[PDB]
Design a protein around this nucleic acid. Structure first.
Ligand SMILES: [Mg+2]
Ligand SMILES: [Mg+2]
Ligand SMILES: [Mg+2]
Ligand SMILES: [Mg+2]
Ligand SMILES: [Mg+2]
Length: 195
RNA sequence: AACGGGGCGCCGCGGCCUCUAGUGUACCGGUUGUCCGGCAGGGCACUGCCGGGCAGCCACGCCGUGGGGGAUAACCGCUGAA
């Protein structure tokens, strides 16, 4: 379809300061300062016109096709996620599932390490990025907290994918005659806010 | 079974000659037949033949011969609207 003009509005919440700066012909840099910290995002080569209006961010498209009109909801969702990150934060939870070999997960510094995964002598080591806090709850839960939902979710995805094997090392998901197979690893169980 | 850790080959490539092996009509010795009168020394038998063998060359000998980064393929995921 074709759109002569479309507009969307994201209401800025209390205590959150938004700055929008034009760094190019169609580029934007957005800074969101909240109680929990600061978030910075870039929107490059975009048809969406972003502006500020008395506590709201206005997103506008003029003479847009479907591919340009779809960007309004995406930018709205990104801005809402940034606001919720600076206000309440983000906290992703992961579960540690083992069948015979317990997987010792530990956070030392900005390395997170998994030992004894399936009895492997090798140890999985992951570099925790800036602005992500990793905590190990008991022998079964992992918590990743931050103010960037994309960064926190990406790190949780990396943690889950570290325990998934590929190639010839991939074990059979199901057992003999249809039972459960060797399903061992760390599974992202969900998300919530810090506050 | 596997990841991970330790050890070593085979194939190829590039060098080297210390060792070992080959050659080595440089060199040294033994010996057959005949000629130089005999001994000695020697000619020829196309090194006469046999044994050893420096240097050099050489392999059948020795030495070196790697991890990493980037963008990616097949795809696997995060966020995410229409
Ligand atoms: Mg060679
Ligand atoms: Mg000889
Ligand atoms: Mg004589
Ligand atoms: Mg004569
Ligand atoms: Mg002769």
């Amino acid at each position: 379809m074709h759109v002569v003009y479309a507009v969307e509005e994201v209401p800025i919440p209390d205590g959150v300061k938004v700055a929008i700066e034009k760094t190019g012909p169609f580029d934007y840099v957005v800074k969101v300062k909240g109680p929990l910290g600061e978030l910075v995002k870039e929107f490059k080569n975009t048809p969406v016109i972003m502006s500020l209006s008395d506590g709201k961010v206005v997103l506008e498209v003029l003479n847009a096709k479907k591919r340009e009109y779809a960007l309004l909801g995406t930018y709205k969702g990104i801005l809402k996620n940034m606001f919720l990150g600076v206000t309440k934060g983000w906290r992703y939870k992961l579960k540690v599932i083992y069948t015979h070999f317990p997987m010792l997960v530990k956070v030392q510094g900005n390395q997170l390490t998994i030992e004894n995964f399936l009895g492997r002598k090798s140890k999985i080591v992951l570099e925790i990025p800036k602005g992500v806090k990793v905590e190990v709850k008991g022998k079964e839960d992992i918590v990743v907290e931050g103010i960037d939902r994309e960064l926190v979710s990406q790190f949780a995805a990396a943690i889950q994918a570290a325990t998934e094997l590929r190639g010839e090392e991939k074990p059979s998901p199901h057992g003999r005659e249809g039972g459960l197979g060797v399903v061992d690893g760390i599974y992202v169980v969900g998300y919530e806010h810090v506050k």
